[PDB]
Design a protein around this ligand. Structure first.
Ligand SMILES: OC[C@H]1O[C@@H](SCCc2ccccc2)[C@H](O)[C@@H](O)[C@H]1O
Ligand SMILES: OC[C@H]1O[C@@H](SCCc2ccccc2)[C@H](O)[C@@H](O)[C@H]1O
Ligand SMILES: [Mg+2]
Ligand SMILES: [Mg+2]
Ligand SMILES: [Mg+2]
Ligand SMILES: [Mg+2]
Ligand code: NA
Ligand code: NA
Ligand code: NA
Ligand code: NA
Lengths: 1022, 205, 205
């Protein structure tokens, strides 16, 4: 057939020409099931005309598309292998996957791609039903092929397509034959379309979404739209449904649209084809408009779904139905008014998160179970919105969001972050045809879904003329949804909303051309009316969400600040296997790929399995839908719900001192939307025992929900009241400690216990009990911590970044600072033994810190350590001011009184609740894929580990791994549990941050910049 | 300067221009024109095309020109000459006093059109006064209205020159041919000749 | 070269697919004269780097694009005739011209065009200067071809283009050779671009 041959097809290179983005590909549309029964359509019964080609296919990998043998068309190669479709062949080991952030995986030479681009050959054998061939049309639907491919059916060339994140459909009516059929797909990893696809994610190619065959009738419903108009009272709704058909047009056939609420039909509409006159030529003869009156309808929202079922069927006038289509209808209105994004007349506060379609085991292939799993976790952590970044998601994902209730921002598959400048392609008229097809086809597919409320042009593509044109197009075809775009400073003419990335609350990054203002300042700019919703903010890379409370304090205060989307939801880490066989999380350059962007791929609020990070409880607390304002005895509960009444809420409050419950009560929460309820508490007992009373209230859901179990906690809050100081006198026991002074060191003895202080170093070398032993490593001052991902920033070994905290600490010599014992004395008071010491940390002749300590050994055995630390102003502020030591004992449990139970930092502790907490040692360690400082508990008054006990207010992160081991280690699986237990008791700790990873984002007040610091802890046994 | 887009034969007139699949073709007819003729001073106004109804492609293409070249206003007649794809109201052959009442696309009086609720744009007739044969009757009415009404900034007469082709008799003598003189059917006969002058070109009265 | 052959090129129909409006066509721009002297540019002196290919070409008319013989690539047909370029072959008597106002000259079935669409084959012989080949870039500029065409240089396929009213430019640096060169142009009267071109005028290709 010569023309069908590879040589002829490959010569006319379609994967390099921007003009050719598709060949013989059908028109875009919402997912057609093509039911032949109205009842099947109504109850969403699986369609017989729709066939899934998912399963075992024959696959072959090739270095280049030209390297593929010609014999592949008629028959498959013997060297071919059997892999599942859909799948990424990179996760099959055929061709390494690569992770890049901004830089292109290939040489930036548009529109050309490398000569050697990995080619995946897919071939399938199947039997087409005879009835399909006789009448109607069959089409194959490639729901997603990454990133370009040529299709062959029975050896003959069908067509060509691009854009991986949208369904490519080809008519196979002419190519198919009776009996065995073969489908040859040549999938190319690199295409000129890759220039439009530079998203911060793992680069994988192949058929990663479903493949299916759809049979339609001769006369078909080629397209249909559903809109919803409302009265100003929102009590009267009209459903105008436009229906297109591919005809085969005739006078007698009809189209009936009916709305069903469960098993009840609320409305119906039957009308002959033909549109109203729209021009001098007339109207559409093949189209029909059906507007259905709905009285007092249920309104769709994230809080209350309330879905409607609409059945659109094309039928003859007699009447038999030719084809039946169905769609889920949600009645809501999304419009910006007076500079405010509104849903159903109510301003919606966006508590959303950015989400990538990622699987640690299956790459970017998405199963139904993982989509549900993510949605439940989101709603269970006070998330009402999801931003599919930065590409059109699975068609089923929108369906799930409709029924569960999640605000969805549908984003077009355009991102040219690697280009210089960023808008080189997007301001190019020749690239306009390619960009438009990435936008137009998305809108046509996802315009029916209620959950989608906002369109997006793309991500980082700068600002070009193509964006303004494409923005205007969406507004023209669909005025129902506002269109947002971040590029060009997020204040361009191509966006209805101001959506800055990682912009900060108070300080504003001053950049040329594209300045990032404060979210408060941005609104106040001259000529600003549009609302501000952060498309991206709070980089959750590793140990983050520091100062996350600042954002949500600003969100609730400022009306035009309607929240934003957190980056990211799930760590994009891939699973690899050791030589021993045990699996470990891989990131960045673990697959032998260079250049790469290392661990920057993991910025999720949860792991990939998917286990919640400790930052996820912080997001949940800040996004809770109930606020609280305590006023003495009375509590005030304000509902942030816009539409739903508190029908299933239960307020429970506990009153405890020292973690000991003194009073408890249950109150039925009956709050109106956006309303405030005053709740009086019974008179509380006054504990004579000294301590601090705590009032903890929580909102519990008694009845089960589709997204949550019964007894679920949605909101909580804790207060501090009625503190009682202790005027008790600890001194003095009948016994008296005894010291022995020698030239070597200092030795203090009290009964069974013995304390030893090294005179050479100035630090205590060993502690004793019994007939017993204690420490494994002397107790010393600690001024550093294992560098977090925030501390590291974009700084690498190859690229030194001066601004990064880790590099400032390296230049200052904090990590390499040696302790110098300038003074060491020991004396005995009448009641207790007191030893006074003073150390100094010096780097290249310059003193960084001066630490003075006065250990006091009570007659009871309790050692009170008074630490006074002075820090130089010239030096960058220390990450922590702390005591650290290694305990030889390894207890299974950790009991402490303070903020918990999960880890918390000065920058991030609002979610943590003060109580007596008890956890295993493994729970005290957070297994971040990239090792660093973790498992810190702040506001701890008492810490019980084994026999040891530490009192006073401090921050601790007891662990099996030292701070020196963590920073040297690159992965979490390489970590070995060191002998004994490492304890870091720090009186002061720097905020972790942060707004973004690439720049220092620790707030000023959270930094340790006082210059002088003091903390005192009482160390005792039992 | 007018783009090479006209879909007058389609039913409806905007069948292709409201089709997303035809957007790539229409854009290349507009973008490449602007890139070529943006330096010329004489060009003062861009045009999206002629009669192509009103589609989403027009609004997008209109926005593109405004983005690349804010120096020139963009006008488009389709959709009633009052659409969002035009900076100026440019009705075809609209009349001075009586207004043609048409469904969907109504042609108002040039005086009435300005006074419509929410109208600010000026009115320039892209086409008016059909000079087919013996015409320009009541042509003085237009120019009395042009000078009186500030927002009425004149218009463009159709047409300048008769599009007549020259044929030859059996005797050899040349004669002006129009419409269906070349054995072509279906045709629109002498409607091709609407010029103010002949083709040689001699001025009409 | 099989790929350069008509059968391979014509199979992938470019004149019917709305997606394909051009192939290997250079970027649009204002008219470049490419002067090598500032004074020549200033006084608008004729440029030496710019060469007009206007003149006598060898032309052949065909009922369909597929009807064109394969031997046409390497050498011109003996049955070919010599007509001036630029010109309309309709006024040369090869294929009647047609005048329509609104109705399409062909059956409204987008994006398809009639199987029998009049094909004009243009071929030119010329000598490229040696200095042009050594350094720089040569490009051919079809200022207007009505309404779609495939270009062949020395037998090899250069590219494809549409839109008659704007210059189609193709880089000929790789295709040109020392000595005699031949330019084969297959101009098609009807293209999917004709749907975007329904102006009230005589239809000529
Ligand atoms: O961590 C990825 C982030 O990169 C930054 S840019 C530069 C930040 C960067 C660059 C190179 C390596 C690591 C981070 C983007 O704005 C974010 O959307 C996100 O993709
Ligand atoms: O005389 C041509 C005119 O036709 C009218 S439409 C219908 C007018 C018409 C239709 C068919 C035959 C003759 C006139 C157009 O609006 C004008 O621009 C001009 O092209
Ligand atoms: Mg391509
Ligand atoms: Mg990016
Ligand atoms: Mg074409
Ligand atoms: Mg016309
Ligand atoms: Na707000
Ligand atoms: Na990232
Ligand atoms: Na005037
Ligand atoms: Na006319």
């Amino acid at each position: 057939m010569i023309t069908d041959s590879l040589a002829v097809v490959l010569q006319r290179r379609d994967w390099e020409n921007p003009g050719v983005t598709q060949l013989n590909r059908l028109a875009a549309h919402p997912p057609f099931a093509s039911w032949r029964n109205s009842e099947e359509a109504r109850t969403d019964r699986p369609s017989q005309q729709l066939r899934s080609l998912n399963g075992e296919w024959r696959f072959a990998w090739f270095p280049a598309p030209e390297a593929v043998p010609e014999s592949w068309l008629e028959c498959d190669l013997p060297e071919a292998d059997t892999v599942v479709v859909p799948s990424n062949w990179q996760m099959h080991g055929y061709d390494a996957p690569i992770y890049t952030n901004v830089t292109y995986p290939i040489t930036v030479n548009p529109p050309f791609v490398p000569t050697e681009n990995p080619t995946g050959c897919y071939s399938l054998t199947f039997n087409v039903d005879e009835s399909w061939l006789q009448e109607g049309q069959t089409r194959i639907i490639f729901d997603g092929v990454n990133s370009a491919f040529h299709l062959w059916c029975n050896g003959r060339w069908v067509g060509y397509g691009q854009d991986s994140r949208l369904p490519s459909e080809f008519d196979l009516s002419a190519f198919l034959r009776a009996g065995e059929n073969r489908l040859a797909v040549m999938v190319l990893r690199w295409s000129d379309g890759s220039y439009l696809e530079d998203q911060d994610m793992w680069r994988m190619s192949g058929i990663f979404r479903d493949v299916s065959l759809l049979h339609k009738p001769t006369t078909q419903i080629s397209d249909f739209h559903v809109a919803t108009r409302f009265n100003d009272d929102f009590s009267r709704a009209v459903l105008e449904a436009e229906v297109q058909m591919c005809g085969e047009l005739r006078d007698y056939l009809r189209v009936t649209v009916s709305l069903w609420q469960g098993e009840t039909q609320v409305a119906s509409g039957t009308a002959p084809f033909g549109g109203e006159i729209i021009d001098e030529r007339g109207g559409y003869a093949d189209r029909v408009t059906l507007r259905l009156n709905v009285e007092n309808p249920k309104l769709w929202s994230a809080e209350i779904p309330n879905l409607y079922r609409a059945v659109v069927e094309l039928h003859t006038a007699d009447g038999t139905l030719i084809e039946a289509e169905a769609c889920d209808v949600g009645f809501r209105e999304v419009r910006i008014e007076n500079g405010l994004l509104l849903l159903n007349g109510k301003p919606l506060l966006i508590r959303g998160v950015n989400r990538h379609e990622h699987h640690p085991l299956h790459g970017q292939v998405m199963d139904e179970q993982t989509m549900v799993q993510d949605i439940l976790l989101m709603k269970q952590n006070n998330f009402n919105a999801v931003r599919c970044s930065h590409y059109p998601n699975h068609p089923l994902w929108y369906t799930l969001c409709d029924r569960y209730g999640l605000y969805v921002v549908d984003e077009a598959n355009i991102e040219t972050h690697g280009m210089v400048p960023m808008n080189r392609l997007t301001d190019d008229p020749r690239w306009l045809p390619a960009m438009s097809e990435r936008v137009t086809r998305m809108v046509q597919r996802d315009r029916n879904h209620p959950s989608v409320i906002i369109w997006s042009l793309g991500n980082e593509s700068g600002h070009g003329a193509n964006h303004d044109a494409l923005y205007r197009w969406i507004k023209s075809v669909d005025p129902s949804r506002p269109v947002q775009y971040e590029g060009g400073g997020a204040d361009t003419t191509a966006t209805d909303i101001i959506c800055p990335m990682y912009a900060r609350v108070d300080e504003d990054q001053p950049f040329p051309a594209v300045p990032k203002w404060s979210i408060k300042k941005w609104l106040s700019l001259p000529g600003e009316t549009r609302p501000l919703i952060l498309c991206e903010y709070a980089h959750a890379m590793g140990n983050s969400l520091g100062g996350f409370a600042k954002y949500w304090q600003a969100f609730r205060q400022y009306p035009r600040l309607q929240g934003g989307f957190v980056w990211d939801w799930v760590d994009q880490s891939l699973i690899k296997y050791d030589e021993n066989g045990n699996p470990w999380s891989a990131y960045g350059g673990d697959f032998g790929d260079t250049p790469n962007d290392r661990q920057f791929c993991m910025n999720g609020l949860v792991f990939a399995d998917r286990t919640p990070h400790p930052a996820l409880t912080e997001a949940k607390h800040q996004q809770q839908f109930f606020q609280f304002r305590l006023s003495g005895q009375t509590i005030e509960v304000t509902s942030e719900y816009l539409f739903r009444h508190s029908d299933n809420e239960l307020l429970h409050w506990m009153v405890a001192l020292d973690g000991k419950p003194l009073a408890s009560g249950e109150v039925p929460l009956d709050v109106a939307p956006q309303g405030k309820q005053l709740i009086e508490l019974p008179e509380l007992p006054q504990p004579e025992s000294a301590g601090q009373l705590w009032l903890t209230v929580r909102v519990v859901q008694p009845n089960a929900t589709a997204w949550s179990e019964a007894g679920h906690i949605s909101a909580w809050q804790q207060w501090r009241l009625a503190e009682n100081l202790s005027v008790t006198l600890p001194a003095a026991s009948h016994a008296i400690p005894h010291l022995t002074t020698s030239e070597m060191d200092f030795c203090i003895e009290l009964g069974n216990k013995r304390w030893q202080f090294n005179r050479q170093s100035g630090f205590l070398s060993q502690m004793w009990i019994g007939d017993k032993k204690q420490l494994l490593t002397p107790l010393r001052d600690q001024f550093t911590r294992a560098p977090l991902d925030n501390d590291i920033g974009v700084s690498e070994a190859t690229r030194i970044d001066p601004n990064a905290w880790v590099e400032r600490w390296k230049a200052a010599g904090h990590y390499q600072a040696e302790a110098a014992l300038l003074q060491c004395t020991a004396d005995t008071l009448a009641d207790a033994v007191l030893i006074t010491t003073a150390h100094a940390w010096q780097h290249q002749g310059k003193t960084l810190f001066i630490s003075r300590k006065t250990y006091r050994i009570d007659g009871s055995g309790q050692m009170a350590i008074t630490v006074d630390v002075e820090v130089a102003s010239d030096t960058p502020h220390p990450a922590r001011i702390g005591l650290n030591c290694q305990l030889a004992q390894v207890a299974e449990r950790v009991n402490w009184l303070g903020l918990g139970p999960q880890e918390n930092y000065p920058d991030r502790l609002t979610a943590a609740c003060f109580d007596r907490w008890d956890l295993p040692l493994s729970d005290m360690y957070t297994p971040y894929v990239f090792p660093s400082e973790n498992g810190l508990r702040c506001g701890t008054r008492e810490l019980n580990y084994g026999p040891h006990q530490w009192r006073g207010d401090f921050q601790f992160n007891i662990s099996r791994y030292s701070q020196q081991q963590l920073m040297e280690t690159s992965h979490r699986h390489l970590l070995h549990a060191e002998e004994g237990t490492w304890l870091n008791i720090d009186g002061f700790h720097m905020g972790i941050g942060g707004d973004d990873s690439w720049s220092p984002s620790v707030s000023a007040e959270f930094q340790l910049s006082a210059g002088r610091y003091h903390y005192q802890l009482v160390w005792c046994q039992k």
